[PDB]
Amino acid sequence: AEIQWMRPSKEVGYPIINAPSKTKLEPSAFHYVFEGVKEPAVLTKNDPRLKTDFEEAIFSKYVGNKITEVDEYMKEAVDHYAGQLMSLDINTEQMCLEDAMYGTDGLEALDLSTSAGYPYVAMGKKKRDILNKQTRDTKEMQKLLDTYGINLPLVTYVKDELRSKTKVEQGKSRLIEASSLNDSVAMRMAFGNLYAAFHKNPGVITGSAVGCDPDLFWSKIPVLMEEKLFAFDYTGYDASLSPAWFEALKMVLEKIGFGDRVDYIDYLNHSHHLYKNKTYCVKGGMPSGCSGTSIFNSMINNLIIRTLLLKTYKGIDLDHLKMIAYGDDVIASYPHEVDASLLAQSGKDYGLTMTPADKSATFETVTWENVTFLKRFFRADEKYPFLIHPVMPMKEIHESIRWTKDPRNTQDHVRSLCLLAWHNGEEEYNKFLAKIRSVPIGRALDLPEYSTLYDRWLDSF
């Protein structure tokens, strides 16, 4: 993606946006009980750890667009994917403001904790001041729509999250481009049924994993995959999507019944931003905080993988391409072996930066033994092999448990980690519970034992 221009918000009539400067993260009761190397990302220029201009580093993700034209391959990719989706019979109807707000089957209600973006972020108005979960009141929202309309600037914040030492010293913090509650609502009405259809059909038909429950879904993946697996990582996926990938996305939407509101896709692609006191225009790239971001990123990944295969392996049978994406992350397969390294080359022509799966030195064969999806490995249950365990590495869990954003959610944070950890084995799990219980805070938590989680799991199928 590329910033077209940038200048003082006041110059163009926009109020300054004040974003916190102090991280809400801090050592937790288990900070010294477990090993960890990650710490809060840099949130301001005045951060002792910085080793380069912050402002300069957070915007270094923008380096241009290598392409701006949907070629022949991309068009064929569009047709094949669009064709697959056609078989789901996605409801092309628009979603009523009520369901678009408080949810329906296939779509959760709006996240009240997340920013309501402009103009409500400099208007001091929050989300609970516009909707009530038990009321189902559209009235307020409706007036707000009619008043400010849509296509409002995206409020840009630095993301408060753990980052390695390096990325802290190089001010490599990630940015949250929050959308106005107005747009988010419009888009859920425009694509609401598309979203639901995807959430209800994680797999190789939607080629999506969004909405999935790893505890159950992991056992279905091997059955959906073809003989030979292949994968790779992306560097700066969102920012790397050229405008052409958005046009191809629109072509797909048009072909499945949504040519109706494809303009919305233009706002994702060519976006208007508000960061601090400045305002800027971005051409290309996916914004991190818009309605559907996850789903559209996955749809585009399906288009991407297909395109690179058509350009590298003419005559390939896409109908035997079995892949599942979740944003940039993907697990794919084909009846025959393919060269990820080659594919990584073709992708470079399309602006994509593909590298060896899970930071490997080079492109090695991908197997059920080493493949990962959503950071989770795949391990057959030692007693009932047909049941597959999604195995998140302890290191991730250790890193995460060493901090906290609110003592009141400690019970939940630790419980959640437990639902991830036990898949590593009873031995490992008990060592984990043991260390948690080696401090006062831990001992006061209500945590599930191994046999309890293993039995619940077996019955859930």
Structure characterization notes:
The chain is an alpha+beta fold and 461 residues long. The protein has 3 domains: 1-13 and 70-202 and 243-284, no CATH class; 213-242 and 292-367, Reverse transcriptase/Diguanylate cyclase domain (Alpha-Beta Plaits, 2-Layer Sandwich); 375-461, Mitochondrial Import Receptor Subunit Tom20, Chain A (Up-down Bundle), CATH 1.20.960. The chain contains 18 helices and 16 strands. It has helices at 54-58, 72-86, 97-102, 139-148, 165-169, 181-200, 214-217, 221-224, 237-240, 243-258, 263-269, 293-312, 340-349, 394-401, 410-421, 426-436, 440-443, 450-460, and strands at residues 2-8, 26-27, 39-40, 154-158, 162-163, 175-178, 228-230, 233-234, 270-275, 278-283, 322-326, 329-334, 354-355, 377-380, 388-391, 403-404. The strands form 6 sheets. It has a 5-stranded mixed β-sheet. It has a 3-stranded antiparallel β-sheet with strand order 7-12-11. 39% of the residues are buried. It is classed as transferase. The entry lists the keywords nucleotidyltransferase, poliovirus, 3D, RNA-dependent, polymerase, N-terminus, transferase.
In one word, what is the shape? globular
Residues in helix, %? 25-40%
Report the radius of gyration as a whole number of Å.
23 Å
Number of strands: 16
Subunit structure: Interacts with Viral protein genome-linked and with protein 3CD.
Subcellular location: Host cytoplasmic vesicle membrane
Cofactor: Mg(2+)
Organism: Poliovirus type 1 (strain Mahoney)
